[PDB]
Amino acid sequence: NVTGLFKDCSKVITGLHPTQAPTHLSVDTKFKTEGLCVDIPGIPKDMTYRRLISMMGFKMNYQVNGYPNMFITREEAIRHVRAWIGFDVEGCHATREAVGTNLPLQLGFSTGVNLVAVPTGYVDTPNNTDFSRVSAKPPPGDQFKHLIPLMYKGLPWNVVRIKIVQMLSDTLKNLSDRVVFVLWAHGFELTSMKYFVKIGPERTCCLCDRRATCFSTASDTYACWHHSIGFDYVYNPFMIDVQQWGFTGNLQSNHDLYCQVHGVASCDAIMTRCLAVHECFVK
């Protein structure tokens, strides 16, 4: 059995040299024998490759002492209803030098905010992983025709994550000590969180005794929602996937059973938080 997490999306017909392959699966077939690999003097390493690696398939089911769980129960989410922020991401597909993965394009929140990112991926090279712009195309359908101009209106991820942190801090500083992202079919939203979320042990703000909700890579410091100006990462967020609550059918059909006033990533994010409130607080 294999997973799609870290799937190599390059179009290169060969695998990697045993010294450069991250795993036994990715070593080129020529080097494989007896369940192991051999070094073959005369077959050199590749010193110019750029292999796009898929961030689809994360599983946050770790249980490590002192690290809070990201995915919480419905009952814990109910206790923190003030922290709820619906979150949905519309993506674009990898193209040209790579195929097989989706990149975040439009990031929408129940605050009505939509942020457009430059199509960016994690590209393995002979020396490291390069977080960089990649070739991409919008999904082929007509219900996503609004995404076509967005391919030319994106912001670099270093700006996008500052804006996410700023938006959440402004919305939540007077509501909660945390954020609970309310999702519907969480896979792609969790893939998108790799671009702006960091986790670890519970920390305190550097300026007050509140729990830290933000992290700054530039200073290696932590902050609550009140003191996060200039911070680039959301730290120890929480989340719940409304789709996993036993619903049959798509988000809109279930949302529309209780609500007729919400009719685009922010719109899906609004409908997700809306369906969650109606399902948890009625009956």
């Binding site: 870290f6 190599d8 999306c9 450069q20 795993t23 699966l25 070593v27 390493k45 790799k194």
Partner: protein, 131 residues
Amino acid sequence: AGNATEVPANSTVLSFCAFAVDAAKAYKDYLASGGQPITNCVKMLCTHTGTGQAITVTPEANMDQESFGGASCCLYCRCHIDHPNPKGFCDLKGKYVQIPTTCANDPVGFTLKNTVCTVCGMWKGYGCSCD
């Protein structure tokens, strides 16, 4: 489309370390909480008549070591995250790493926790002989 690089047994640990502020501490803490070491490393079939040096251009395992492909023993390569040196370049990717047989159940953790002697090129404690 695309070719899988991983197996489901590594999803949890790799996801945890891929999101961590401090990936090295996250892997050590994951192991301390009873997590299984990262598997699917590039283990080499070799003569075991090598020099026994820690990081080499060809496999150099002696009779008390196993040789592995370098990138496969690097937590930062495995999680596709930043390497913590100022230049951001890896010292294991593109080389082979020799790991003591007693520690070959967790090559990623072995390289994370251990250091190579800059004088003799052997792992400190396994067995750098120069004091």
